[model samples]
Target chain A: KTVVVTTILESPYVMMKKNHEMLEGNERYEGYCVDLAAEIAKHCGFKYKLTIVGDGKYGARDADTKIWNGMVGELVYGKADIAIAPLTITLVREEVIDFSKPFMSLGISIMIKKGTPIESAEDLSKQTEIAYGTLDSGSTKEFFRRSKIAVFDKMWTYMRSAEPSVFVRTTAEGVARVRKSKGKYAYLLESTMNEYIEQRKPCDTMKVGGNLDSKGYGIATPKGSSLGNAVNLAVLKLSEQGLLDKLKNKWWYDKGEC
Target chain B: KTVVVTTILESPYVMMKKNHEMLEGNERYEGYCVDLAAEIAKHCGFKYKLTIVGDGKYGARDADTKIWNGMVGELVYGKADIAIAPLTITLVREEVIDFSKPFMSLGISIMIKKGTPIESAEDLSKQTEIAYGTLDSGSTKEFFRRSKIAVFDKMWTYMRSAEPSVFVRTTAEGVARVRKSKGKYAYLLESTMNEYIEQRKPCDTMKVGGNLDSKGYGIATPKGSSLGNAVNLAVLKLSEQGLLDKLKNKWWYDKGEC
Candidate 1:
């Protein structure tokens, strides 16, 4: 049976096909996430249908109405069997769905406009004046929101008070805001995506630091999904075999910002 | 102001507790090596009166012949910075005198009589195996020598093949030889000790499997005789915390077990 996998058109993980306007059902998008799905399906003896996530929104419970968005909602609402986007592994997500062992490892990283005088993750932890926030709808936000560490502790202070105008909707928005805003606003996002963005022309931003905390991108399946076991272990085995490393290089290095 | 340190009895770490009868000293007697003479002196705002190594024959690499044994050789011959008794950190001894981390964050494991049906580190990798290995010397040998794991890459093999075994000699011999002779010669070294030992436990007796290779003690010193700035951040901090936990529960945990 072909499993339906709902994803998002986030760069590095997924991108609208250059020919999407003339493409066919579900195949109109292509990117690393698509490639990964193909490879993983081959390894685990499965077939999948890829669909860009709804409204192109990364999911979060609506603070007021409690409605979910994107692939997260897809799985929660039974619209899809799994998700392979650049989704982060977070406890909040874990509460509603299961995740495979992480396929790509990363930590929350700081993105600064090029030559912004930052060198590493530790540096961000020490400063008081520099303000940073995560993609409005993802794991980075949750990590800081739930953290007890000094850096996150400080971050929560601003996040809880920041005007909605400054908070971002996605990592793309946050990273763009960092660069376009003249480094006045730094973005904290997944290391993987940050590294991908580092290659774009004008490449105004650089990913800095040794990740604040380690995390992995997991294959998400609905809660108590029977396929979770096979999927999770498959990811772990691939990790052990260095497949993830090869895939990351293929996407980030070989493709070179496409 | 030189800070006073206390270390437990274990291999590659401490041996005799500063002359045994009186837990104190300046000369190389027992315990692991250390750059304490430099780092603590720098940060704690004190001038070291003397730096001490344990007298007990923890893990040593007798320079003359090359093997792991007493604390003096581990330090004087340059195998570790400070020998924390029952230590297991190897490649580490080469860098400094051996400051020693803690006794065992790893669990107490089993060592069995050899040649039993059990074999390999993987058999014990899960929770199925009844057997285990431990320190070949100190208390970690039995926990592993009797275990069953993915491979029997015994600690003794590592020690003998290690670059600095030229100094190794004594004590562990009784066990290593006994292990070869007995069908059920087991040990119960700490997991930390087991790993550090396997990376460098002396001799030819095979490290069976279990190993419970979780965590244990380590010792370090300042870079050169100067002791690097505050001894790096996480390395010293986590270790100190781990050690404190062990000391608080030492007697309550390790009761000269079977």
Candidate 2:
């Protein structure tokens, strides 16, 4: 009997199969994160099915709507055993769910249209032509908002009331906003995400800034889930084995077609 | 009225007053731990005398005699409000006393006589002529004994029985043994001690291998002491301010002849 593994359709983790229902057991549709989940389940003695995060967006809470999405919603509301997406661990989310030791680390970097004058998030914080925003309710946005640290405190103040328009609902929306904003709006998100987009065939943006601070991706489980230990240990074992880097290069460096 | 706080003398932490009782109160010989003790006593509304550990040796149980010594006994038998020495935090000590969140982090490392062939503790662990032992009942030995991890499992087996035949009861004893053994034995102790030993004249030894794991040097106090919170937060605050490292370097680096 397979365990019901709740997952999100975030790229390099889970993605739509060309054949839909026919590809249920097909291994090809499974990418880095999916592969990691499968390997962890095997080591920990659980079989599983990858179910898409019930919501369409990757872990965001709509400020105006007050709703959640992606694995964040799935785990918080009790629809998943574990979340294997590239989920950033944050203090706000930690209050509601548990996360395992980081499987990967990333830092917040800015993505602006290729010709935008803003070279970094710091530059954008002081600008008027380009309004910058992070994905609402995700680590990107949360860090700026909750920081007591200097540069981040200044940046947070600007983003909080950017006035007429501000903030996206998801990483996808944030990147899309960057691409179509005609160099007037910038996206702030994971270094890995910006790097991933930079290599795509139609790559239209660039990542800048050396990373604000240390942040990492963690395996998330709803509070009190029994599978947390298995998942955490699995990440450590994989990290020790170099499998995490192998997958990162496979998706981010190897398969990327720009 | 200043509070007469107490402390122990550990290398680079507390030192004897060269001026003896002739100097003014604040002018008496002081070191890193001494300064920290003064800071804490001040913050908590008190004053103190920075005394050396009562015994000449580091706190440990004698292999043949089974006796405890130094600041450890002082705290155990109630002679000090706090021993802000380089007291390694360990469960064995925690049983009878209390410790604050570590003033500093250190882990057991190997101090081998200069030109010894080995580079890591793992290498030393695999040999017998190159014997190794931890500061008895201190965090180093207990870490090996208490670890749930496998690498340390091998270490526990060696120390539990080495006793009188191979184990030294105190850190000073271990250092003396390492020096006298003429490269035959290695002392496995804190990196702080290792670094201090490296600076002195006749630096016949060099530390090898990375620290085994993270362990804190806590602000130790007798159980139920009223000064616990004030002391702990003092250590944490100094850590945040980056003052702790400065003090360690001041005393430890100046140790050119010890």
Candidate 3:
């Protein structure tokens, strides 16, 4: 049977190629994760179909309904055989899905307009001139809500009560906010994406501080999926052979505009 | 010479009591920080005049003008001999000023209205139903704006760009938003303050989830200020003698309404 792979629309991960209109099947897409998915299938000896998560969310369980959403839901309900996107490995997530060893390492970081005054976590925590927040539906938001650190916890408390809202549905919105806020806002995001954007055209933003926590993105499979072992090994092999690094360079830097 | 001590108007730390008109000098104030200042002044054998920071900020440096603002500014410019309030101890401030060892320890926390559908950071991050944010100019806002941790940074990104504006001018304003927004908004703030408010009247809001990071509140002085050693030693002695704990209980619990 051909594997159904679930992913999301995050940039430099999985995206429609310029000539997608003239392409068929998986060739319709090109990016760091798209290439990795193909390489994974090749190395694991499996045929696959790439599908995006239906709801467009990364994944989260509804508190009252207890319903799982996003790619994890797709896998939990047996709709997908695996997920090949840049999904994080979190404790709550691990309880429902199996993750291969992390294919990428990154942490949370601050994204600020180039002329913004802040340079560190402490600096942000001490000032009130700049408004800041996290994605509404991602691991990063969950991380702050659950963190026990003094500064981060205080931030969560403030964000949880903010009015007119302080969250966005997608990363693109967050990036746009920074570009238009006139140095009034700062975005917190994964260091990798922050760095990638820093290298993109317009280059009005920069990653100004060190990460808040350490984590990795892993290829995920539903619990007890037979492909888990094969995919895990394939990722490890690619990492060891420098393919992962090379692919990162291909999508993120080698095609750089800035 | 009498020392001019500067602070802020945050509740239970320093405030103009309803009965403040009946008192004069130090007697006009009552709170944990107020009492601690009295104890420190007594132990340091100094005559002091307590004043509020004119800008009402904990502290921050203007990016363009390079001007320090709030309590830190007051200290830096010789407007105050010391800052004895709920000011957070951060590395950036340490470069310009020195802090006495912490007299109080706390972390950032979430404040939620009763029956809200959220229970953790993950829950908040994944839903658009609940809107959250931090104070406009405080440690909590800065924490998100400056965070490098994966989750917190991502959250900062979202908050910075959120429309309708989530940032508020004061903790009182944030708390008021949570009360008025019903279950729709959550506030991020210091756990000590969160817990204190949770025990107060109305008692409609509760602290949910764990803290984001660990930090402490210290008595601040201008860098190389001669009072640094005495104030640090006084704080340590008070902590060891259980006086600090007793003061916390007196202000936070003994005065409880709900």
Candidate 4:
């Protein structure tokens, strides 16, 4: 049986090729994740198909309905066999699903316009002239929402009550706001995405300050999924062989515009 | 029932207090893991006893006898309830034991005597003047044994047949060799331990080069043990609250004499 791999359309992870419209099925997508899925499938000796997540959100639980959404929902409802994406491994998520050891490490980071007066989260929190927020319905947002750290808590409070709704629906939206907001807006995002954007053509933005927290992206599956074991070992083997680092360099720097 | 925790007596992770012989039971030990165990029990609401591993090795399977040894064996044979040491999360070990999300991150790194003429693994692999080796019977050895990377494979080949057997039975033995060998020998171990040693009194050692591989240490429990789930959540909670980092700083730097 072909494995139904659920993923999201995120730049440098999973994205449409320039000629995607002329292509069909999996060939339409290319990026770090597209390549990773192929490597994982090859190692695990499985035939697979890639399908972009319908809602395009990473994954989050709806507090009101107690339902999961995004790729996580796809796995929970058996719509997909596995999720190969930049999905985070979290305590809540691990309750309903199994995640392989992290294939990549990342942390919540600050993205600011070049020459922005802000240098750290504390700097952003101490002033209101400049505004910052995270990708909605994602770990970055949830981190602040659940954080007990005084500085992060203060930042979360400001973001929750901002006049114009500082949160963006996507990472690209957040990056774009940073580039176009004339230093008035900063984006809080995963360091992987922030670093990738820092090397892109427009180069009008920079990642400032050390990471706020540490975490990793793992391949997730439904709780007790049979494929979980093989997939986990594949990630570890690939990591040990240096394939993961090679792939990151391939997609992020080798193909970088800057 | 009192939970039984198996841990190793590695400095900065677990060690005998200066007055340990005068104390009893849990009070006889203190370090990063000691504090971590206390915090975990408090959050999880459990009474526990801390026992030092009998074999003194960090868990490795004997190829000839197929018997697991060290703290891992303790949990595997039901000698202890859980393990809270600097035990690495590896594929082989994970098969028989469960690991909480990593409480500390580390990577294989190089430790050199002060002023040693080395900066990276590539440099070490090329030179015959400065010999290098890893701790015997552990992940560092296992990494090189299974490594297919060109540079690391060459390193393994050299260390395996080096005159006088370069591998040390313990991390302390490796550090002592480096300190006494002048510039003729270098030790390879986890970055956490290497960094810890670099900050100690009579500090004549330094960690050079980037880590060869990235991994973390996790709390371990027997396979399918009921404590696995709660311990995992407690680790995540402590990590999120910055308690883990605080404890690290407290043990590694706050107590440093140099």
Index of the highest-lDDT prediction: 4
Report iRMS (Å) of candidate 4. 1.6
Two-way DockQ contest, 2 vs 3, winner: 2
When 1 and 4 are scored with DockQ, the better candidate is 4
Better of 1 and 3 by lDDT: 3
* Candidate 1 lDDT by residue in tens digits, B89-178: 333243334333222344444433435455544443333223233333342342233333333435434333535231212335434633
Ranking by TM-score: 4, 2, 1, 3
Q: Please list all clashing residue pairs in model 2, or write none if there are none.
A: B3-B47, B9-B53
- Clashes in model 4: which pairs? none
Question: Better model by TM-score, 2 or 3?
Answer: 2
Mark the regions of model 1 whose C-alpha exceeds 4 Å error after superposition: A119-131, B1-258
- Each model's backbone clash number: 119, 2, 63, 0
Report how far off residue B258 is in candidate 1 (Å). 35
Runs with alpha carbons beyond 4 Å of true place in candidate 4? B256-258
Instruction: Give one digit per residue, the lDDT tens place, for model 2 in A1-258.
Output: 666666656565676656666644535366778878878887888877777666654576667876667778888787777777888766456656777656666678888889888776567766678888887656677667666666668888888877855787656788888888898888888898889888885688998767765445778888878887567657655654456767888888898787
Best by DockQ: 4
lDDT of each: 0.56, 0.71, 0.84, 0.92
What docking grade does candidate 3 earn?
Answer: incorrect
Interface RMSD, in order shown: 13.7, 9.1, 17.9, 1.6
Error of 3 at B111 (Å): 49
| Number of the top TM-score candidate | 4
RMSD to native for every prediction?
17.1, 9.3, 22.6, 1.6
